[PDB]
Amino acid sequence: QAYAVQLKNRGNHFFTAKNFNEAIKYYQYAIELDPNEPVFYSNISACYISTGDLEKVIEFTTKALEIKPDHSKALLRRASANESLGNFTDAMFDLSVLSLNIEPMLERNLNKQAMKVLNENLSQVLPSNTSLASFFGIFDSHLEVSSVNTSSNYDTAYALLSDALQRLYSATDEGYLVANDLLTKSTDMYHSLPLRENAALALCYTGIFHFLKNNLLDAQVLLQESINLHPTPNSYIFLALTLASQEFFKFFQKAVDLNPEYPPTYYHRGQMYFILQDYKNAKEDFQKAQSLNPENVYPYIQLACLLYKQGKFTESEAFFNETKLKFPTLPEVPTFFAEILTDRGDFDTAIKQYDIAKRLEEVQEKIHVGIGPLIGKATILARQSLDEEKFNAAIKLLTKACELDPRSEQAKIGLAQLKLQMEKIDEAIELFEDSAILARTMDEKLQATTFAEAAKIQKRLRADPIISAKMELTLARYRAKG
């Protein structure tokens, strides 16, 4: 034992002078006298990483870790050689064990893994019914259905298009699936074929559905085609949304030119002004939308929301109250108000407003706010929760929301984070992975894939009794120290 230490120190001398071959020779000498010492194997791996033999690093760190599984230098070296070799999951596992005895190394490996899995996964599906009802909420449903021209002598596809629009504007689960289906059919039929006006209408709505399905290129193609056939406010609005400031506002002026009295033109432009912090022009556009369609709840909602974002909560609350008196049965009112209240930190009143909205949504024949209230209440309850009643209540609401609107990535992500918190990790992974498929942008997809890949490491850590015990002890100690 003692002579083996002397030999290791001789090896250390050769290591310091960058004579790695002589160092390994002395460390192996030490192993021949005392093979139960992890440091000897660990020291050999330092020689192999300095020369660049990553495969041997893994061999010798592993031999160290087979003796002493918490050996910090051998864990760090093994993770380094694993990362270099592209074994990110293996690196993440060693770094997690090390973290229990680094954080940017773990994150780097997670991001390398998530990026890898997303690319493999990448080499037709509608958004949630809730999102669809929200998107189409501003439109005058009678006007849109009635916009189909029946006076043609050659159009054999008008009646199918009429049906597609009726089903779309029914604002139902089945209606959106049927509309998507019949709209694609109509577009094919119009390509084969008042007719030009109907063709542009079919292409316009098929175009926006492509935008909503995340087919941005297919959206622009059918929309520009629609404009070429018979330009309408809708087609310019829809193309401007597909391409989202200078160009956006150019398209909206073209929309304005075609019909200065079309309410959704000013609503959608007001939304852009709102996002761009131009509160003056946003207000003026929402007021234009309201005057042109005083029966639509959404312009009122946005004017109230504007008052809040400008720091006038009292005036906002009063505007919401005034809106309540005009629209007493519409869940949109308490839903957006509950969003304001949550943001203001008033969780008690937000829950009450979400309860009202849930009740109003249940009695409506059409979808208005969908699962919005369920997500909203559950997110508050989960945040308010050691409080097992509120946590399990949040689980029940999000499970219900996932069941009612299966294509909602928001609901799945919400439920998964909670499943993960209660160590239902397999369930969390599945939910995260389904959320990645449903996710829209590249960053949202990578985000959901990142959650899944991180969750799989947690699963792997939890499967080991010793690591699992260590993890639980860490949490227990943290809570006790608090």
């Binding site: 090896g11 310091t16 160092a23 330092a46």
Partner: peptide, 4 residues
């Protein structure tokens, strides 16, 4: 980088 470092040896024990």
């Amino acid at each position: 980088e470092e040896v024990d």
